[PDB]
Write a protein that binds this ligand. Structure first.
Ligand SMILES: Cc1ncc(C[n+]2c([C@@](C)(O)P(=O)(O)OCCc3cn([C@H](Cc4ccccc4)C(=O)O)nn3)sc(CCOP(=O)(O)OP(=O)(O)O)c2C)c(N)n1
Ligand SMILES: Cc1ncc(C[n+]2c([C@@](C)(O)P(=O)(O)OCCc3cn([C@H](Cc4ccccc4)C(=O)O)nn3)sc(CCOP(=O)(O)OP(=O)(O)O)c2C)c(N)n1
Ligand SMILES: [Mg+2]
Ligand SMILES: [Mg+2]
Ligand code: NA
Ligand code: NA
Lengths: 576, 595
């Protein structure tokens, strides 16, 4: 066996039987294990490699699950799961029925918080420490937060309260100068250069120290965890530590495809994502529109903006992991005559709900939202599934919402949004779509749907990913109409009145929760028109969806093509 | 006239014609004017009094509307409106048809941002500065932010970006150590030990011909300086606004400066009732608010439940928690103006076996949407939300009307939602939430309700509605404030049923199926937007049951509601008792005519 030490470790108690001089050899076994686990692709390789040493030291010094160790985001905690009885389960991580890719309270007593969104560790740790003190208990509370997660407002404000309350707790700042891209912000710049950067926070500050010296970290943790008041242990790590290819390019190896550990060669994703279609469109648009300015909250790569940032460096802003700052900064730009575009994932847009409502919508400002990862994202599970934006955006006055069926319709909606007054949201899923020629800028009327298949018996209303399911479902069913419901706000009131009054039954399909989303909008509009057709609302149930493929989630949610055909048969359609 | 200088000032241009030595006399006129404006009650007296001198200095040095002066919250900007052509309109401020109580872009070219929620000034200012630089323009950008607003995460994160971009802009930190209550947080404690610097007489001006609390932000830091020395503020602003990179000017002000009663108690005088400026005596609010009913209930509950822990984001007074904080000091937490921290801290408490209660206004709960969804709901944690100012709040207008919580909470899996009709039902819902698994939200309006005896703790079944008026022909479904309208509307209409729909999540599926299948028409009423709220929930449930009765959904339209009385907003929205009677007549009910 290549891992003699790890073979005897089934929990933190087994780990403590090792001597301190054996810990360096253990971290090497852990790194090799993490490399093999991630070699199949789609996992958080570089972040978990960087955190191996601090995780080993923390579990060697602390007594989990009696002590609580909290991970921010949780993507860097593969060594934590390997050391807490889940080594064998790492083979199926993020697979349906397997363990989560992040720490999850229901999965293990050793997982103190359920995470996926960034910057929640500090407020969670404060609550646990206050609860401990209120109950008269004495256990240790420790939080591991990266330099990227520290840019979030809810981490900075929580630290302000933590310094005020002065309770026993340890914060490990895992500083590798990386987020997904290189980290941004003034704090990141300041820390690159004997002063306590958190002196105004009233928090004890130790470091920076070598985040890969596992024996020194153990020695340090032993002399800090029992001190009075909160402490920040600032460690410096190399993202991807232990794999030369990952250290050289920590951006790609943050989430590599299937790769060969001996050569570093990986499967290039030669697909054309929706993200690349947006990036191509907005890079093209900004060439002729000097008012366009793109803001991302730390997702230049995921949103498809690498080429944009290179071609338009003076129209690009990365605010770090601060979705709230991204939206309100865009509002200020719109107030000064710009045409800002906020590129943001649906799940992360949840963080900026009040900024959309209060800072953008009240004055009806010219902010365009290009919303990636809309709908079920799949393997990242409940913390990342973007199945709520059709509900929470819809109830904001003046926020228009569109769902493009392809890249040409995306360009048409972006063009409309950038040339018309007020806020517009354009949401599209994880996945691929056909490339269109440069200069494709069709004119569309916002709010007008388009019928794609004839039929008056039963008519399916769907947009985006749900529309692909609907067209496939009605593929061989004459008389089943399909309408591209590419606008959720406003609805096509004229076509809905006509179709709702003439059809015996309607089906709405949405890659969104059924609660208050597109189906609810259709029912509200039909009621206002005093029309009462039979309607089957298909969508994600009012339940969080665990990690699986999006197709599996959609099959069990009842929105894929076979599920629609079953509903069609229930409505009396002659399905073969 | 008592105000000879102000009588000749109709804008910043007139102000600049004064000499610097006349500015102290002008601030005295402005303070007297603000006191008279606020004497009718219901206005932000102490904050605007504290900000008189910095506002006068900013308009004397800068050139609004060419330069942009941004106010965080905007409640401290009465002197700003008086100096920008709105002096006469101050008599009708926050009244329907009058000017807003906060700065508003559509109201004046001098109002750079529309505000009400705190901590938005810094990100807005950053966007304006980036837009200015992208367009090649050269105007000044200045933001005024209080020490309370600086506790918000979106202000701290924006400052981190502001230091990174390094653009020309000025941030005035208006530090009075007050939020509503005394300010909290480590930054407030740290700045208490900072000594005031004397620049204009000129010790500090000679020293540079001592620590920066924002050193890690890469921002120039000047101060703290006397925030009431208007000539020194002018002298400082002239020598700062044209420098490269961002600057924080830290000023120290006294909340309520100029009125002895307000300086002595800046908490009450943050928003005083009708008062006599010569005596300081004010009309006491002898009413019993929903806030007081919640405060009494949770203070009583925590005596027998050591797991209860109340968290507020800087709203101890408004949420009714003053007595709680005194009776249960070790079970009370104020996180500052950081709703996001309040909810996630409560999540951490629930994970360690506590029974936290988050007290929060509906409009401010919007700030914590993701923390409710991601940090509380995914693991179905024991957080109870007691939501004040639910529905239309009225005079504070669009930035404060809490008409969205029945929509954004309803689509979060596992979040139960209740609307108590009175204090006994509030206690019943609080009792249920604190003894059952998962998150619960209890929302109630600004306004009053009868006091109930101590020890009132009824048992209710969460999710069960209660019929209050007989009738199967037409049935009104409403809860909370909307229910009072419904009962008043059907008061003399036998056969018009009224159901206390006191639970929005879940609905009473059993009663809705029976009533929806037997009634020819239903009316839903909600103090909430009609988009995705209670009416939408009923339509979704009726559709799942394949029931198609006539349904009239009454609620707030899909439009922001400007400042007015709640009664005026509800009259025009169509949910008050006369509007319901009109709908009943449209549905064929024999409603007595008035002729
Ligand atoms: C509030 C908020 N805002 C943003 C984020 C996003 N984010 C985090 C993550 C885990 O969602 P993300 O990986 O981006 O997955 C976003 C969703 C996603 C998934 N796929 C996969 C491809 C794939 C990607 C990554 C790994 C494996 C496969 C696909 O589609 O095939 N593509 N995209 S992590 C981080 C930096 C932390 O920086 P630090 O705190 O310094 O930590 P450090 O790594 O340096 O140790 C950031 C910014 C967040 N959490 N929360
Ligand atoms: C995200 C967020 N969270 C919270 C707030 C609340 N808040 C602000 C306000 C203007 O809503 P609020 O007044 O509380 O009105 C809240 C709504 C409200 C209205 N009535 C009236 C009673 C009344 C109150 C006030 C004036 C007049 C009458 C009623 O019903 O009869 N009762 N309640 S102001 C501030 C401190 C800033 O501190 P600083 O930044 O340091 O400024 P400083 O004052 O020191 O100069 C805070 C915390 C906010 N903005 N944004
Ligand atoms: Mg990092
Ligand atoms: Mg203050
Ligand atoms: Na626009
Ligand atoms: Na509970």
């Amino acid at each position: 066996s290549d891992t003699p030490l790890l073979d005897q470790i089934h929990g933190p108690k087994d780990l403590k039987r090792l001597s301190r001089e054996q810990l360096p050899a253990l971290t090497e076994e852990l790194r090799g294990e993490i490399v093999r686990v991630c070699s199949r692709g789609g996992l958080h390789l570089a972040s978990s490699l960087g955190a191996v040493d601090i995780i080993t030291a923390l579990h060697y010094v602390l007594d989990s699950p009696r002590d609580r160790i909290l991970f921010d985001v949780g993507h860097q905690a593969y060594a934590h799961k390997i050391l807490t009885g889940r080594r064998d389960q790492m083979a199926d991580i993020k697979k349906e029925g397997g363990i989560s890719g992040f720490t999850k309270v229901s999965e293990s007593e050793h997982d103190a918080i359920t995470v996926g969104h960034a910057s929640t560790s500090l407020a969670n740790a404060l609550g646990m420490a206050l609860a401990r003190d209120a109950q008269g208990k004495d256990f240790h509370v420790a939080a591991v937060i990266g330099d990227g997660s520290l840019t979030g407002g809810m981490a900075l404000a929580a630290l302000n309260t933590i310094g005020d309350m002065g309770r026993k707790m340890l914060i490990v700042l895992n500083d590798n100068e990386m987020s997904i891209s290189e980290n941004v912000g003034a704090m990141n710049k300041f820390m690159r250069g004997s002063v306590n950067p958190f002196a105004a926070m009233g928090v004890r500050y130790v470091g920076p120290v070598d985040g890969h010296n596992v024996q020194e970290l153990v020695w340090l943790l032993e002399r800090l965890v029992d001190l009075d008041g909160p402490t920040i242990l600032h460690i410096v790590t190399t993202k991807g530590k232990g794999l030369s290819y990952a250290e050289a390019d920590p951006i790609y190896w943050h989430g590599p495809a299937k790769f060969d550990p001996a050569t570093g060669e990986y499967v290039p994703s030669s697909a054309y994502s929706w993200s690349a279609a947006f990036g191509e469109a907005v890079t093209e648009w900004a060439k002729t529109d000097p008012r366009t300015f793109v803001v991302t909250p730390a997702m230049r790569e995921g949103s498809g903006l690498v080429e944009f940032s290179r071609v338009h460096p003076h129209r690009y802003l990365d605010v770090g992991i601060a979705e709230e700052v991204a939206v309100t900064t865009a509002a200020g730009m719109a107030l000064q005559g710009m045409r800002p575009v906020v590129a943001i994932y649906s799940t992360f847009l949840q963080r900026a709900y009040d900024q959309v409502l209060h800072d953008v919508a009240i004055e009806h400002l010219n902010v365009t939202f290009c919303i990636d990862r809309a709908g079920i994202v799949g393997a990242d599970g409940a913390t990342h599934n973007g199945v709520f934006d059709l509900s929470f955006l819809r109830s904001i006055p003046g926020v228009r919402i569109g769902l493009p069926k392809d890249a040409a319709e995306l360009r048409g909606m972006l063009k409309y949004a950038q040339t018309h007054d007020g806020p517009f949201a354009i949401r599209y899923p994880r996945g691929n779509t056909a490339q269109v020629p440069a200069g494709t800028w069709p004119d569309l009327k916002w709010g007008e749907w388009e019928r794609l298949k004839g039929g008056d018996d039963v008519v399916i209303l769907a947009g985006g990913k749900a529309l692909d399911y609907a067209l496939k479902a009605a593929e061989d069913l004459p008389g089943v109409g399909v309408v591209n419901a590419r606008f959720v706000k406003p609805l096509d009131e004229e076509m809905l009145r006509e179709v709702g009054g003439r059809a015996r039954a309607l089906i709405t399909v949405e890659d969104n929760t059924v609660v208050g989303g597109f189906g609810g909008a259709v029912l509200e509009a039909l009621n206002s028109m005093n029309l009462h057709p039979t309607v089957r609302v298909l969508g994600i149930p009012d339940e969080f969806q665990e990690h699986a493929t999006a197709e599996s989630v959609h099959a069990r949610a009842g929105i894929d093509a076979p599920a629609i055909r079953t509903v069609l048969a229930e409505l009396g359609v002659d399905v073969p």
